[PDB]
Design a protein around this ligand. Structure first.
Ligand SMILES: O=C(O)[C@H](Cc1ccccc1)N(Cc1cccc(C(F)(F)F)c1)C(=O)c1ccc(Cl)cc1Cl
Length: 558
């Protein structure tokens, strides 16, 4: 079956779109090569349509059915509850797309009678009808990148009412089931630090380690009807309320498997027969399907002691080496099996014998040293995209503040500490907006975070060592330095000069701002300070942060 069939109608914009980096008076302090940054827009949607439209074939062998039976055995130990309407409503982003039925995201969060009444009629319809295709809107994502130009990604999502219904029926399932079925291989259960720890321990557990990242080409498009019905059979293994079983069956038949695509102008754009990128189950469905195909492919390839780390379509495997030559051969067979399972590769997989050289979830393990002088492994990444998006956010307020999200996920890195923290705290000072909560995302879920809570939040997730790492690796230092040049960003020596100023300024404010100056920029002074556990860090309720992935899932954790 074709992943998509098209009518010719265009994927249309929902408002004005900007592709060129907006420039203000602050832009140059961060980046000078403005032409390197761009945002994707609907004008490239047609190009994306061509890459994502292809036929899918599947050859399912005994290794595939063996792994699935095992997955189903673990799934049968899961007991999940139906969420109430109020709970589901409270999980809805404040600015989530409004319903076509006369109410918006605020109406839902306030439990307005119109929204709640319509939500109840959608739920009832799900229970009575298990066949009628549910409508979806298809949009082109406006996302920022650096050159080396890619076309806009596509986002397909059902109406707001249906989304609240997905939450009622499946939020508990998608939040609980993956870790049970996949154990330690489920990546979304890990904070950046725990991820590193799982990777380092998994690597150290092999006599002769070897690992590779496996990039699937347009994964959502490779997901077949079979795949989606198999995912549902796994959900159905759970101990669930009868109403939840019916809604899951209905949602699978009417929405997950396929459905008509409508543009922002209300025209039919065509029909989808693959994974929708904008539904509650996108992350969980992709993770389970990637793990099932890969686990089975590991068996077919005769990979020795293969350990998976899977986050949606992002896949990394660490196993026992059989020698340089044999490895190359096994990987080839692994890739052939995945292809048979409808998970063909984009970039061909290549074995790596150096853990730090493996990139998964666009990140890699690197090493530095803490106060004591001890080696500490931490998660970093190429800062090109973080900086391109930071440049955009320097001149444009956007719904998701990636700079904040990146400071939280990459607080221990050289680049997040010296550039992002310095740059944005300088702006918050100047605009006196330090206590203004801002929306950012972690594993797809949206959170309102106050920048003044950063010190505590970081202590909680990375430990106090995040404020004292040093002696980064020549490789890391050099990648950052080279990145600054490609983008036209001031050299690290300049950010250090700046950080000294930002730090003195925060300190002058006292209170929380002073804590920020003290912990976040202790690295900027030749005579470092104390830095002891922050009493308020234990107060923060970080339960739910690193539990599951919700990318495209319309999730908000207030
Ligand atoms: O330890 C390191 O790896 C860097 C190495 C480095 C190399 C090139 C550019 C920036 C850092 N330096 C050593 C260092 C400190 C101050 C000034 C320099 C200079 F002059 F070389 F840029 C280097 C630091 O003291 C340092 C440590 C943590 C953080 Cl968050 C920031 C800094 Cl600056």
């Amino acid at each position: 079956s074709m992943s998509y069939t098209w009518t010719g109608a265009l994927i249309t914009p929902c408002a004005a779109e900007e592709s060129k980096l907006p420039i203000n008076a602050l832009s140059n302090s961060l980046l000078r090569h403005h032409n390197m940054v761009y945002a994707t827009t609907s004008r490239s949607a047609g190009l994306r349509q061509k890459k994502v439209t292809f036929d899918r074939l599947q050859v399912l062998d005994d290794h595939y059915r063996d792994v699935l039976k095992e997955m189903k055995a673990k799934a049968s130990t899961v007991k999940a509850k139906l969420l109430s309407v109020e709970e589901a409503c409270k999980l809805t982003p404040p600015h989530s797309a409004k319903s076509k039925f006369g109410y918006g995201a605020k109406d839902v969060r306030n439990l307005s009678s119109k929204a709640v009444n319509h939500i109840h009629s959608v739920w009832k319809d799900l229970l009575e009808d298990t066949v009628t295709p549910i409508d979806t809107t298809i949009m082109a994502k406006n996302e920022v990148f650096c050159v080396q130009r890619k076309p806009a990604r596509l986002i397909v999502f059902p109406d707001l009412g249906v989304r609240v219904c997905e939450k009622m029926a499946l939020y508990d399932v998608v939040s609980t089931l993956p870790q049970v079925v996949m154990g330690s291989s489920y990546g979304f259960q890990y904070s950046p630090g725990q991820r590193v720890e799982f990777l380092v321990n998994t690597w150290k557990s092999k006599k002769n380690p070897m690992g590779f990242s496996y990039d699937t080409r347009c994964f959502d498009s490779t997901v077949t009807e079979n795949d989606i019905r198999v995912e549902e059979s796994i959900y159905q293994c759970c101990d669930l309320a009868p109403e939840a079983r019916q809604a899951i069956k209905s949602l699978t038949e009417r929405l997950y498997i396929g459905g008509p695509l409508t543009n922002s102008k209300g025209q039919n754009c065509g029909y989808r027969r693959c994974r929708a990128s904008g539904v509650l189950t996108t992350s969980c469905g992709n993770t389970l399907t990637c793990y099932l195909k890969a686990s089975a492919a590991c068996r077919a390839a005769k990979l020795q002691d293969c350990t998976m780390l899977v986050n949606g379509d992002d896949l990394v495997v660490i196993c026992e080496s059989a020698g340089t030559q044999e490895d190359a051969a096994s990987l080839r067979v692994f890739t052939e099996a995945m292809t048979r399972y409808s998970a063909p590769p984009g970039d061909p997989p290549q074995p790596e014998y150096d853990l730090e050289l493996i990139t998964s979830c666009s990140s890699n393990v690197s090493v530095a040293h803490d106060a004591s002088g001890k080696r500490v492994y931490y998660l970093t990444r190429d800062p090109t995209t973080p900086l391109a998006r930071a440049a955009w956010e320097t001149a444009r307020h956007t719904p998701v503040n990636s700079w904040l999200g990146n400071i939280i996920m990459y607080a221990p890195t050289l680049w997040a500490r010296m550039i992002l923290m310095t740059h944005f705290f300088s702006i918050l000072l100047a605009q006196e907006q330090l206590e203004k909560a801002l929306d950012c995302q972690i594993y797809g879920a949206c959170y309102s975070i106050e920048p003044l809570d950063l010190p505590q939040i970081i202590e909680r997730l990375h430990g106090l060592s995040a404020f004292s790492l040093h002696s980064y690796s020549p490789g890391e230092i050099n990648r950052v330095a080279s990145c600054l040049r490609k983008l036209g960003v001031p050299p690290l020596r300049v950010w250090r000069h700046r950080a000294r100023s930002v730090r003195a300024r925060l300190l002058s404010q006292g209170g929380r701002a002073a804590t920020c100056g003290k912990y976040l920029f202790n690295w900027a002074v030749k005579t470092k300070l104390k830095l002891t556990p922050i009493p308020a860090a234990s107060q923060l309720d970080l339960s739910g942060w690193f539990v599951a992935g919700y990318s495209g899932g319309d999730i908000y954790h207030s």
